[PDB]
């Protein structure tokens, strides 16, 4: 049993969002099992969007249920689901789950198979190249036996970036944050610890490639 | 419609530990068909949740058996009996008793460490950001534990809670601590409008706060 759910990746707000769950291994409608879509917004818990049963009969969550259509087509083993007008509220995971049971007894049901998940991000930005900074301490912090040094990579859509440290070679004590979406765009950044005596002796460059721009930009930290 | 309310919502265990987490329902979540559609799922880490119990009780198919689900009505628990590195992530309780179905808010399960203070460093504004009038100030706190802890940024000596951006890491493969950064923006103008800025972070390894500041001007 497989679940695959597909979606548009990234829209603008105002725009309608169309997922599809494409089920395999199995049959919607010799198996009679239901269908529900589940979304999770980043760093948050889990929320029940609607249902669909086998006879095509519906429930939805009352607070989205104006916005929502839940569907199905049983001959092409899918159940889709449509949000109305999405705003910077709907950027989630959104999951199809199967309510599975075991052999006959139907009313023993519960969420045997989920998919991988189909991320959505709402935003009005156009592709934009990150803002790559390096951040070197303070003109005063580099006494004690260990030096920290960043990089922040602002400003950017879509995601992902890459960040490496001197290309990949510095790879112990590097911290790198999950980006962070604010006003349409993208702010990750990224911490090196290394001892007082490798900076400034030794070049450390932060090295940013954004492949929706086309992207790769290096940065030497530098004593202020 | 049906609050489900997980306690605690952060469980630090260590490994081969037994572990057990409530869910309490606001009301009855027995079906009219008699039946109580309370299940557990776990989510770990890139992954989507997987069903771990249903019908209160029921291990699903493939489940250690060191997994069980307990409870009726209203309180209900999971217990893993002996917690293995594979069992870290969150867990959700969830009832379909009742439309519209509802998740607990998840009990992150951790492993257990000892007290680590943060390494806490402060980073001005790049030359290069400020050709661009907006100007980041980027606080790290680094190789923490408990998770628990308080940024606080001051502008001017006066605390300022607008423009702030944090983002956090799991808890680290080689250490178990925890790690955040915090990036106050402003624009260019008010930057250099003002002229200290601190990062004060509050955790439970000292009584005092740790500050780090600088003077624009300095």
């Known amino acids: 049993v497989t679940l695959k759910e597909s979606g548009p990746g990234l829209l603008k707000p105002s725009q309608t969002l169309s997922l599809t769950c494409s089920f395999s291994?199995?049959?919607?409608?010799?198996?009679?099992?239901?269908v529900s879509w589940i979304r999770q917004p980043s760093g948050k818990g889990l929320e029940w969007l609607a249902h669909?049963?086998?006879?095509?009969?519906?429930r939805y969550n009352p607070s989205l249920e104006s916005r929502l259509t839940i569907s199905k087509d049983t001959s092409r083993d899918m159940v889709f689901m449509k949000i109305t007008s999405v705003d910077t509220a709907d950027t989630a995971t959104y999951y199809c789950?199967?309510?599975?049971?075991?052999?006959?007894?139907?009313?023993?049901?519960?969420?045997?198979?989920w998919g991988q998940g189909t991320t959505l991000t709402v935003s009005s930005a156009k592709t934009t190249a990150p803002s790559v900074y390096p951040l070197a301490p303070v003109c005063g912090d580099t006494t004690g036996s260990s030096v920290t040094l960043g990089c922040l990579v602002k400003g950017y859509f879509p995601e992902p970036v890459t960040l490496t440290w001197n290309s990949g070679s510095l790879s112990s004590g590097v911290h790198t944050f999950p980006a962070v979406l604010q006003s349409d765009l993208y702010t990750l950044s990224s911490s090196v610890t290394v001892t007082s005596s490798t900076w400034p002796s030794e070049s450390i460059t932060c090295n940013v490639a954004h492949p929706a721009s086309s992207t790769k930009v290096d940065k030497k930290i530098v004593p202020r | 419609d049906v609050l489900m309310t997980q306690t605690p919502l952060s469980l630090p265990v260590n490994l081969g530990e037994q572990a057990s987490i409530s869910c309490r329902s606001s009301?009855?979540?027995?079906?009219?068909?008699?039946?109580?559609?309370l299940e557990w799922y776990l989510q770990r880490p890139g992954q989507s949740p997987k069903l771990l119990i249903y019908?209160?009780?029921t291990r699903f198919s493939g489940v250690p058996d060191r997994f069980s689900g307990s409870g009726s009505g209203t309180d209900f628990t999971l217990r893993i009996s002996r917690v293995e590195a594979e069992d870290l992530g969150v867990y959700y309780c969830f009832q379909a008793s009742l439309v519209p179905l509802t998740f607990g808010a998840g009990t992150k399960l951790e492993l257990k460490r000892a007290d680590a203070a943060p390494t806490v460093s402060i980073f001005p504004p790049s030359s290069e950001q400020l050709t661009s009038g907006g100007a980041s100030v980027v606080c790290f706190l680094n190789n923490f534990y408990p998770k628990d802890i308080n940024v606080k940024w001051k502008i001017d000596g006066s605390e300022r809670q607008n423009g702030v951006l944090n983002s956090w890491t799991d808890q680290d493969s080689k250490d178990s601590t925890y790690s955040m950064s915090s990036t106050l923006t402003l624009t260019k103008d008010e930057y250099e409008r003002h002229n200290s800025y601190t990062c004060e972070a509050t955790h439970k390894t000292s009584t005092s706060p740790i500050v780090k500041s600088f003077n624009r001007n300095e």
């Open positions: 291994g199995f049959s919607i409608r010799t198996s009679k099992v239901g």
């Open positions: 789950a199967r309510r599975g049971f075991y052999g006959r007894k139907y009313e023993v049901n519960h969420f045997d198979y």
């Open positions: 669909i049963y086998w006879d095509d009969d519906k």
């Open positions: 009301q009855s979540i027995v079906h009219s068909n008699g039946h109580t559609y």
């Open positions: 019908q209160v009780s």
